Write a protein that binds this ligand. Structure first.
Ligand code: SAM
Ligand code: SAM
Lengths: 253, 265
């Protein structure tokens, strides 16, 4: 095996993932979402069982198709090498009902995936991973997104200044996006805020909150009421709940 | 190394071992602190023997009245994340009995049942959200993922020590306990959760005493629990495509209960 070892390097460290511009995706369901949403598939790896769905995948996705022994597939029956898109902020569409999420400096890839799943499911339009972060294309992120990665554009952006240039430009085409930070001890209960406006929701780190550079640029900062001093919420759970509040207002009136 | 060491190491694997020994491992100065604060008996306190020893570790050692063993750093990498964080202290904590009476039941009861979880991390996450949003207890049904799995404990971020969590094999024991609470004067309603549920979560009355049922990641709620439900509720979704992780869903709905209870809207 040789080109196999290039595929194995994509599981481990993100340096090699970035240079090749591609990543691993497993499961008939995730791959089909990738095909359906226009993501390129350079290679398609497959085990003797084979499902009805996996079979239909082979005779429909017209790309390089390679058989593998059960041994080497590490427990999945299909794996795809998928073309990683460019990190363009215009992949996120901005309309009058904008609802987006920024995740500030996350250390948990699992948490990124979770946010994508939740933002996809609750009708948000895009996610931004800002700053020195764990990789959107890390397998823990791909897995826990559950295929939402392909329907909900996640864009990676090292500088917070580049996010502000895009936001200000969206503002210039009449779309009054408000930045809404989130925090345990904020100035405004989450259910008192008007989520019917175009909204970019800023979600903080697991150990630090939001950076202080993001708290300054926030128009408003909202909080979910908590039972006590000792308690707080995980990033993905908290963000799910706020996104849900937004949907509720938008549906309620 | 030691035969003592091998018994503690075996507390990382299957659930039956921890149950029969009546103990589990708590890793880190902070979660061990919350165990001592909320009164969990500590049987043994292990620590680094070629010592960095921080102030916090040192305060634990001289404050907790228990057996105290210096251990070599290598041994102490029993579990952390074989990648993230060797702990300088690890406690052997006593596991409480699986008695539902540990969950207090009042007129404004709010409880959660998690039905045969596949993933232990999800349990701890629910423990942490239920704790933080004012739920009064967690029940975990089945012999799947275990409340006292290291991933569950780690994931609860200490909340395991303040929010009572009880394991039950099957619905039967839970129903005996619910009917008993109803007879004593608290009309607990069983509320199942499902993407295709009978009514929207914000159209349901969460001010009433509630046991909220959260299903598992790949199967949802079992058919036995759907049959026992007084009602089913749903977070509306964007399409027929995505769905929600169980802890995330449970957090959204616990939050909804909290919102209604801040009396009104
Ligand atoms: C574990 S908290 C961060 C810890 C906290 N900022 C600190 O000073 O230690 C992770 C993230 O989830 C969100 N979060 C957690 N609990 C929240 C709450 N009660 N209200 C609003 N956001 C919350 C926030 O966005 C926060 O940045
Ligand atoms: C991944 S979901 C269940 C999966 C589903 N039965 C399936 O077809 O695979 C895990 C649990 O989270 C909760 N949940 C997820 N999405 C929900 C939603 N939209 N409304 C209410 N509960 C939801 C439910 O308790 C559910 O059982």
């Amino acid at each position: 095996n040789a080109r196999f070892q290039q595929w194995q390097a994509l599981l481990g460290n993100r340096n090699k993932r970035t240079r090749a511009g591609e990543f691993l995706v497993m499961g008939v369901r995730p791959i089909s979402l990738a095909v359906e949403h226009g993501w390129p598939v350079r290679t398609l790896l497959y085990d003797r069982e084979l499902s009805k769905w996996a079979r239909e995948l082979l005779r429909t996705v017209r790309t390089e198709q390679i058989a593998m022994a059960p041994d080497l597939l590490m427990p999945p029956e299909v794996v795809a090498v998928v073309e990683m898109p460019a990190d363009d902020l215009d992949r996120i569409p901005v309309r009058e009902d904008f609802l987006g999420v920024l995740f500030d400096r996350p250390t948990s890839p699992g948490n990124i995936g979770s946010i994508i799943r939740s933002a996809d499911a609750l009708g948000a339009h895009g996610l931004i991973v800002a700053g020195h972060a764990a990789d959107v294309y890390d397998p823990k992120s791909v897995r826990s997104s559950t295929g939402s990665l392909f329907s909900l554009p996640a864009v990676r952006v090292p500088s917070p200044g580049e996010v502000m240039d895009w936001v200000e430009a969206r503002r210039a085409a009449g779309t009054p996006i408000v930045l809404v930070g989130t925090d345990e001890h904020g100035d405004c209960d989450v259910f008192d805020f008007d989520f019917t406006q175009p909204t970019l929701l800023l979600i903080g780190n697991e150990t630090a909150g939001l950076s202080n550079a993001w708290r300054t640029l926030c128009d408003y900062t909202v909080s979910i009421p908590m039972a006590g001093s000792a308690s707080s919420l995980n990033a993905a759970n908290a963000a799910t709940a706020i996104l849900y509040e937004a949907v509720r207002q938008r549906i309620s009136g």
